[PDB]
């Protein structure tokens, strides 16, 4: 019955993930590999193709693309918030603790979910209607090319784990319910929720990836790696803010005193 309840929890999380996140890894892989009747994405691989694809998806291109990433991130933060509110126990936490969990969690989840839409060659954008190449993004002038590339670097390593949406739903939940985020007021209720989510994740991986005993331990390490990854992202965004002569208010709020 305990294991049965952990599977029920896994399924609840998956169902909530499907309601919260329009752009699933399943749907993204169907597009990337070509197994879809739907329209093929418009490929953007240089300045010329970017200009042509404007409708399918005075400021210079690098800035235009950076603002695009910002607006998608804003949309993603809202999706992640909705998903967080579906995790059993989350909305009953102290509201300021809920804020803290999102503040420190959202960019780790954004990196995770971005991987679902990436391969080694590029990233799906605009609900899969566009595909922008990694090479085009990396070639953008300093400091914007180096802002893009680490997201692909992480995706390549993370996608090697071959997680599916059912695995990801639980992985994301575990990350959000991290009891060691700076400034949390009531730690134990968060830790108790996370302990149960971790049990659900372990069972999920044992059943869904029986030939990969190492996967749970590897995912625990990825959660640790993501903190370092996001600290570097935030540093780079602080650099851009001071060295480039705009930042969305929601993102400004998240980065402030992070």
């Amino acid at each position: 019955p305990e294991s049965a309840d952990l599977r029920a929890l896994a399924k609840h999380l998956y169902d909530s993930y499907i309601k919260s996140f329009p752009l699933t890894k399943a749907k993204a892989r169907a597009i990337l590999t070509g197994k879809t009747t739907d329209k093929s994405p418009f490929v953007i691989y240089d300045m010329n193709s970017l200009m042509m694809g404007e409708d399918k998806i005075s400021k210079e291109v690098a800035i235009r693309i950076f603002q695009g990433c910002q607006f998608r991130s804003v949309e993603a933060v809202q999706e992640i918030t909705e998903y967080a509110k579906s995790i059993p126990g989350f909305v009953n936490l102290d509201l300021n603790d809920q804020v803290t969990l999102l503040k420190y969690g959202v960019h780790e989840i954004i990196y995770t979910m971005l991987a679902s839409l990436m391969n080694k060659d590029g990233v799906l954008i605009s609900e899969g209607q566009g595909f922008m190449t990694r090479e085009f993004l990396k070639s953008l002038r300093k400091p914007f090319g180096d802002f893009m590339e680490p997201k692909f670097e992480f995706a390549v390593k993370f996608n090697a784990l071959e997680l599916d949406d059912s695995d990801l739903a639980i992985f994301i939940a575990v990350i959000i319910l991290s009891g060691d985020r700076p400034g949390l007021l009531n730690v134990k209720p968060i830790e108790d929720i996370q302990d149960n989510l971790l049990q659900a994740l372990e069972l999920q991986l044992k059943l869904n990836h029986p030939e990969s005993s190492q996967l749970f331990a590897k995912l625990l390490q990825k959660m640790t790696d993501l903190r370092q990854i996001v600290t570097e992202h935030v540093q780079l965004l602080q650099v851009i803010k001071k060295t480039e002569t705009s930042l969305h208010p929601l993102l400004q709020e998240i980065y402030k005193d992070l």
């Binding site: 918030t81 509110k85 909305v91 509201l95 804020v99 999102l102 503040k103 208010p249 929601l250 709020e253």
Partner: peptide, 10 residues
């Protein structure tokens, strides 16, 4: 805050 507003919206 904006996060708080997002959290409170049913």
């Amino acid at each position: 805050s904006l996060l708080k507003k997002l959290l409170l919206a049913p």
